[PDB]
Write a protein that binds this DNA or RNA. Structure first.
Ligand SMILES: [Mg+2]
Ligand SMILES: [Mg+2]
Ligand SMILES: [Mg+2]
Ligand SMILES: [Mg+2]
Ligand SMILES: [Mg+2]
Ligand SMILES: [Mg+2]
Ligand SMILES: [Mg+2]
Ligand SMILES: [Mg+2]
Ligand SMILES: [Mg+2]
Ligand SMILES: [Mg+2]
Ligand SMILES: [Mg+2]
Ligand SMILES: [Mg+2]
Ligand SMILES: [Mg+2]
Ligand SMILES: [Mg+2]
Ligand SMILES: [Mg+2]
Ligand SMILES: [Mg+2]
Ligand SMILES: [Mg+2]
Ligand SMILES: [Mg+2]
Ligand SMILES: [Mg+2]
Ligand SMILES: [Mg+2]
Ligand SMILES: [Mg+2]
Ligand SMILES: [Mg+2]
Ligand SMILES: [Mg+2]
Ligand SMILES: [Mg+2]
Ligand SMILES: [Mg+2]
Ligand SMILES: [Mg+2]
Ligand SMILES: [Mg+2]
Ligand SMILES: [Mg+2]
Ligand SMILES: [Mg+2]
Ligand SMILES: [Mg+2]
Ligand SMILES: [Mg+2]
Ligand SMILES: [Mg+2]
Ligand SMILES: [Mg+2]
Ligand SMILES: [Mg+2]
Ligand SMILES: [Zn+2]
Lengths: 5, 104, 118, 205
RNA sequence: GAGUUUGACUGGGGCGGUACACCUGUCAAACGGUAACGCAGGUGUCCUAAGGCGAGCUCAGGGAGGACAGAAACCUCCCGUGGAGCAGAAGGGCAAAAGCUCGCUUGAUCUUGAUUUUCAGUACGAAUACAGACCGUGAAAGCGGGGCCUCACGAUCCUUCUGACCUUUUGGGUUUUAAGCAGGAGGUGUCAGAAAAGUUACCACAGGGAUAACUGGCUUGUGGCGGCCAAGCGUUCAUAGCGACGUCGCUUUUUGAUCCUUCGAUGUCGGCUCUUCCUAUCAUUGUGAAGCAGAAUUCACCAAGCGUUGGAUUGUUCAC
RNA sequence: UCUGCCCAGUGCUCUGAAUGUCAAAGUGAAGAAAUUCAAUGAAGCGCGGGUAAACGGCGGGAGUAACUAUGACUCUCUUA
RNA sequence: GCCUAGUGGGCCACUUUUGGUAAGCAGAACUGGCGCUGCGGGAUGAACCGAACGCCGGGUUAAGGCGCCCGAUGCCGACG
RNA sequence: GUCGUCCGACCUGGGUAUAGGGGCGAAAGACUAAUCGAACCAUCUAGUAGCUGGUUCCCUCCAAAGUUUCCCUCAGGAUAGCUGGCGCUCUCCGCAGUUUUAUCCGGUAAAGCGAAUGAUUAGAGGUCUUGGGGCCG
RNA sequence: ACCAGGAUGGCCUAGUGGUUAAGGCGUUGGACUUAAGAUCCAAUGGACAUGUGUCCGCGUCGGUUUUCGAACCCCA
């Protein structure tokens, strides 16, 4: 997925 | 600045103050057979590209003024150089300034 | 750096533009010197307005660059600014000599017009 | 607009007057420091009451104008339109700053001049009113009302002196009589026994 | 097509700026030293004199006079501790001067060492006393080896120039050359001195909570809420309800400020669902007060027990 | 169904002894020679044309019509 | 006199003190601490107060305390 | 499960051709043996790391630094300072994070503005040293 | 907010090194014409945006104000 960017 | 073309000053050959003619010192032509030039040429020949630094980051707007003072006595005629402070405009023997005169 | 080489490229482009500017100024100058009819006088008058005003914008950018402390040798800029001023003062002489009417206050104060060969 | 006075109540910084180093300072809100009969003589308004500070704090120019409006309104209501003389004895000289933040943060956080604020010590007079002796309760209520415009604790003190002078009210009248004080507008001029004798002859002619 | 580079400081980094080499006043707490992207400023120049000596004067400003002439042109007298000037920034210094005007000049020359300043007690730069010459100037005492002082600048390698009946130019000798020795310059301002453009959302590695983007913590400017004082509003009437000019607070449901925890990972907006808590109470219970006649509506108290909805648009919180 | 305007810039291309710069080799001279000086002088840069269905680009401020607006109109600055 | 490791991220407090509205904020001076350090006390606690430490017995203290937790007022404590 | 296409730039087996800064691409930096913004294997190679992690028995004695200056220096060095060890030269006059007696030094706190500079509030007393005006000329 | 600029006749623009106030349009007066434009002969005007410093002297150079326009305000 993708975390806090 | 303005310096005159004649100065009576010390001469190391005469051991005495003598009159001198004053000229601005010019950077001489580079000889091809100075040792550093020969080493530079043979280091730059072939492949490898540039082998010594090339100075770019120029910051001074002014060169230090150097005067060639040459003694006028025909037996001596000795040359030496005297370095004066930096100045943007340099004049040799221009005109002695005058006081209390009208501006035009 | 690329900033300095940028600045230098715009200097060379501007000095080139001043070079063709003075050349075209002296072109239209000698055409007005050879001008035949009145309408030719006012047209090369107007073309000298266009070129000297272009040249005045160019001197304005040159004087901003002379005021800058990012340039170390300014002899090309000072000589180009002198050349621009020379063209400006010549144009000012021509606009005086043409725009003064023959019987205005200036003409009735001092007529003169020495006309050197005459 | 401007911050509440609790931001600049305490004399934390060094004194910072407007000068050639502090420019772009707006004018103080208070401008007039004397109200009532300024032209009243020294024998017309003998009774003087002070509002004396009790803290080492900083009074804003806005507060110094609000208190002089409050005291002026009560004294024109109670003593009548001209029956008093109010002197505000602080002039706002200390400039307070502001670092307005709409980001830079505390980078280059030196303030622009926000306002003018006076510095008062423990025991220094803030406001003084001189008037006739029968207006004493009107003076006390005027300073007590003007107290609420000011932060911190102020006392009301009826002074021992005679109006806006450095001389005591009891010794004042007979030392006027002995020609030691010549009345000169609002206050007096002291005449010592030290000048040339032509001044003594002119005074005792 | 190849190889490489693409400064640093920094209340994260980038943009901005230069606090990167220097100088003044302050900070700076009365020896000295002393920090911040602290404050107000300046520097990379200028001078054949604005260097040096001697002599003569005295400046800024003010008063009073005198044809044109007036506010201001010039002549004169008086007062004049400097309120002028000394190239500049500022500070210090200076009156038969260090200022202004003349006269003569070139100590702004050559050569060792020592010292101060920054300092490691190193260099450079700058400076200080000396000494050895050779000069200038003055009647002489003296003074001068740049500028009244505090600033105005530059290593090695290379180049260039100057100096000596100089050294070497390697088997010997001669001559050109070349290399040395000594003294200036050509310059590195990132100023103890690499030769250097970007982009990466296709990205990679070593690390960092020394360092940002949430929550939490300190703070409360700003946001929000509430007081005190009472000039005024309210036909009157300060205070039913309000409330200017001022001033004191609270809260962390606003944004900031900071960077303490976490970068060998605490899943980053909304909505749906579901439970509970707070009160600064919209409604309902009980009340008090109104410029509360009734009705309606305000303001206030005990009070959070129980409620506070269905939808169009928008991902929205918010909004309507 | 049309495909407007701009060759100033940056590219591309054309022209070349009338030519500013121009390396090596070659040529002239001085010297003992290394060497130095000079004359000549290629392509390319500069110079001059052409090209936008090449890359690309294609303005500002005022006054002005029997209410008021608006601005067909005028003025001016300005570019390729 | 020689050789020399480690260090060259610091942080806190009285008083002085700069920026900031302020901050368990950023920056200096002086001295003392913490870091490097346990112990008695402040319930708890890097830094506050007392005091610095070999392994023990007796005694005594400091700062703190003495209703009960919890050693010590369970004094016929004083004045409000 | 629902779907795109299913006579044509269709689907498919075998053979063959192109190989790593190369191939091949109806173009997504896609594919090239589960590997692709440069495959895989072995070697150079134990590549370098101012950066993380770890670093093995006891007792005794001494005991820090986060500061100076310079550095493409700011997570690092050099240098001084602090430290330890090894001593050594003497002692068994000298010195001191201290006072006293002398003597100089300073411009901070305070204070001042009827003192210079700068800022600034209010009246008062004067005249012509000027001006603005009413009124008599 | 930061950087860079720009403020001059009534409008639109010039203008230095420091001494000259410039041009176009407009306005005004007279000619031409029956008259008006066009055309011809002439004339005036500038808070040089402000104050300060430099200089003998500034619109011009240098710092501070007051109105304006342009570029940037990024990574989460
Ligand atoms: Mg070759
Ligand atoms: Mg402060
Ligand atoms: Mg950095
Ligand atoms: Mg001290
Ligand atoms: Mg003299
Ligand atoms: Mg001597
Ligand atoms: Mg001198
Ligand atoms: Mg080297
Ligand atoms: Mg993309
Ligand atoms: Mg942290
Ligand atoms: Mg608030
Ligand atoms: Mg009323
Ligand atoms: Mg974890
Ligand atoms: Mg997890
Ligand atoms: Mg979790
Ligand atoms: Mg309640
Ligand atoms: Mg087209
Ligand atoms: Mg073209
Ligand atoms: Mg484009
Ligand atoms: Mg701190
Ligand atoms: Mg910190
Ligand atoms: Mg540690
Ligand atoms: Mg210790
Ligand atoms: Mg301890
Ligand atoms: Mg406790
Ligand atoms: Mg204590
Ligand atoms: Mg015991
Ligand atoms: Mg207890
Ligand atoms: Mg395919
Ligand atoms: Mg792509
Ligand atoms: Mg590092
Ligand atoms: Mg580490
Ligand atoms: Mg001091
Ligand atoms: Mg004081
Ligand atoms: Zn000689």
């Amino acid at each position: 997925s993708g975390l806090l960017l | 600045v303005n310096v005159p073309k004649t100065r009576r000053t010390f001469c190391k050959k005469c051991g005495k103050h003598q009159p001198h003619k004053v000229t601005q010192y010019k950077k001489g032509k580079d000889s091809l057979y100075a040792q550093g030039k020969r080493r530079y040429d043979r280091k730059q020949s072939g492949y490898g590209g540039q082998t010594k630094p090339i100075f770019r980051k120029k910051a001074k707007t002014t060169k230090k003024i150097v005067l060639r003072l040459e003694c006028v006595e025909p037996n001596c005629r000795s040359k030496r150089m005297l370095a004066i402070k930096r100045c943007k405009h340099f004049e040799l023997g221009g005109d002695k300034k005058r006081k209390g005169q009208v501006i035009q | 750096m690329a900033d300095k080489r940028k600045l230098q490229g715009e200097i060379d482009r501007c000095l080139k533009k001043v070079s063709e500017g003075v050349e075209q100024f002296e072109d239209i100058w000698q055409k007005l010197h050879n001008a035949a009819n009145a309408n030719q006088k006012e047209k090369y008058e107007a073309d000298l307005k266009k070129e000297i005003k272009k040249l005045q914008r160019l001197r304005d950018q040159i004087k901003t660059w002379v005021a800058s402390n990012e340039i170390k040798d300014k002899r090309q800029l000072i000589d180009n600014r002198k050349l621009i001023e020379t063209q400006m003062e010549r144009f000012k002489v021509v606009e005086r000599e043409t725009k003064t009417k023959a019987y205005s206050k200036e003409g009735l104060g001092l007529a003169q017009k020495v006309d050197p060969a005459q | 607009g401007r911050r509440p006075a609790r931001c600049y109540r305490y004399c934390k910084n060094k004194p910072y007057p407007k000068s050639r180093f502090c420019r772009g300072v707006p004018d103080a809100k208070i401008r007039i420091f004397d109200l009532g009969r300024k032209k009243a003589k020294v024998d017309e308004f003998p009774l003087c009451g002070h509002m004396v500070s009790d803290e080492y704090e900083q009074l804003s120019s806005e507060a110094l104008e609000a208190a002089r409006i409050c005291a002026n309104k009560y004294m024109v209501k109670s003593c009548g339109k001209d029956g008093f003389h109010i002197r505000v004895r602080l002039h706002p000289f200390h400039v307070i700053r502001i670092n307005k933040m709409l980001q830079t943060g505390m980078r280059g956080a030196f303030g622009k001049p926000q306002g003018t604020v006076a510095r008062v010590h423990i025991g220094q007079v803030i406001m003084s009113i001189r008037t006739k002796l029968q207006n004493k309760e009107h003076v006390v209520e005027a300073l007590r009302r003007a107290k609420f415009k000011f932060p911190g604790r102020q006392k009301i003190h009826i002074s021992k002196k005679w109006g806006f002078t450095k001389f005591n009210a009891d010794e004042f009248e007979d030392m006027v009589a002995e020609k030691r004080l010549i009345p000169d507008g609002c206050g007096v001029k002291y005449i010592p026994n030290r000048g040339p004798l032509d001044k003594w002859r002119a005074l005792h002619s």
